[model samples]
Target: AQYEDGKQYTTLEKPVAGAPQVLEFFSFFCPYCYQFEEVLHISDNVKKKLPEGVKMTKYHVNFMGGDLGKDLTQAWAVAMALGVEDKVTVPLFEGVQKTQTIRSASDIRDVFINAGIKGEEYDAAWNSFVVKSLVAQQEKAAADVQLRGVPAMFVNGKYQLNPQGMDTSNMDVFVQQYADTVKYLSEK
Candidate 1:
């Protein structure tokens, strides 16, 4: 279970100033990402296994939706700000990737509304300083890591996990190993 460097993960040349921090770079429009959320339950599993004070942060990447990608990222940040992430994350993914709905920022707004957020509240958070900062931070972090794919996990802002290395032929094995690898890296 020793994850080899370059195969299972990579060590950054200039690591960011945080150890035991897990940042997941994913997109709402990615089918695999949706599976990671709904089917695999990767984040939840990893959270449970990770050591205390080792937190995971999900960063919605803006590479899939083209010009609308930032909008989706903003929507994600808005959900985080409004404390409705548990309520709306999967629904947003289902709407954008599975149901073929949610094409605009307005549509994203509606998803929030359906989740019980007021229109004015959504608008405020969407335009808030914290949301804007988070969106920018996500983009910069993704670019800094030279992320070339979705569902990328950066641990301690230094090591990037290679999901491809996991044995994905079996769902149970894949989930277990993926979480185990993250847990190992978090403490490394």
Candidate 2:
């Protein structure tokens, strides 16, 4: 599916239909993504405190090639298309980061269960046609955006490059800055 111009792509549109003032692109494997999670959580709470039109959405970027990223991406797409994003996104992130062991589809499935999603329903969604299509769509989006790495974000259509300038030692600060930038742009 072609991405609509000026709107951030997300998994949960029906829950928040209006165009979000901010868009965040992230990846489970990205340390910066992990660091930024706090900001996102806080921002989400702050958004709830604000007026109705405020919104934020996260798009998972499958930058790491191979089966691991592919499986995660497929799961993400499936969750979004099935309208279970609120149930799956956080667990999915935790599953990928909680252990040093190799992450796989089963690991993600386990996360779903931990997040209170029924195993059968999770399995059904994981293997569904919508997931397969979403996997393909994610690949196409990655290519179209020419993503250079994981955890890249775009606010109002402008890409936010990692600020560490080739080294990631300052990833925490960079992530917070990115969040601040997003908040700044959103209020403009």
Candidate 3:
């Protein structure tokens, strides 16, 4: 029963395309997501296992921390516009779940600025149409997934892998299995 349909993976009604798109639904307020990034480093780990041409995107969910969640989504959009997602994601997560230093949009802006994004550029991006559109799209995608939990991964927007199906007897094995399942679905 390894990697069986409805077990290891569930087919989504609407299929999304990329060079084999891998969309991750996460929230800064999610402790599990924090562990996934800080401890397991799932995104980076999975990126290594996947073949080239795969576009892995992280969608910040807006259903986690009320208004703060949506604001964080916008902040993520700003990071995207500034090409600082790699530099800011971990710090933003740490800011929220670790140090408890990020509480408002201003705090998020500070984080971006600290990442070398200029204040004027940050404001421009914060108010830019492109970033705003991205924020809306990400928010909608997060909602459309109807996720009951955070840190959910979908392949090409169609196959949702079930973590419970992974060989969780060991940490390394589980991560390997998880990445393998994603690879299999991405190719399928």
In terms of TM-score, which candidate is strongest? 1
Error of 2 at 77 (Å): 1.4
lDDT tens digits, residues 96-160, model 3?
99999999999998888898889999998899999989898886776666677888998877889
TM-score per candidate: 0.93, 0.64, 0.91
TM-score of 2: 0.64
Error of 2 at 116 (Å): 2.2
Return whichever of 1 and 2 wins on TM-score: 1
Return the lDDT, model 1, position 161.
83
Candidate 2 lDDT for residue 41 = 57
Local error of candidate 1 at residue 90 (angstroms): 1.1
The Cα error of candidate 1 at residue 112, in Å, is 0.4
C-alpha RMSD in Å of predicted model 3 compared with the true structure: 1.9
**lDDT of each residue in 39-89, candidate 1, tens digit only:** 999999989899988877888888888977878888888877777889998
Q: Whole-model lDDT, candidate 1?
A: 0.84
* Candidate 3 Cα deviation (angstroms), residue 110: 1.4
Off by over 4 Å in 1: none
lDDT of 2 by residue, 91-174 (tens): 656666765443667777777677777888888877888778777766655554556675655444443333343324565544
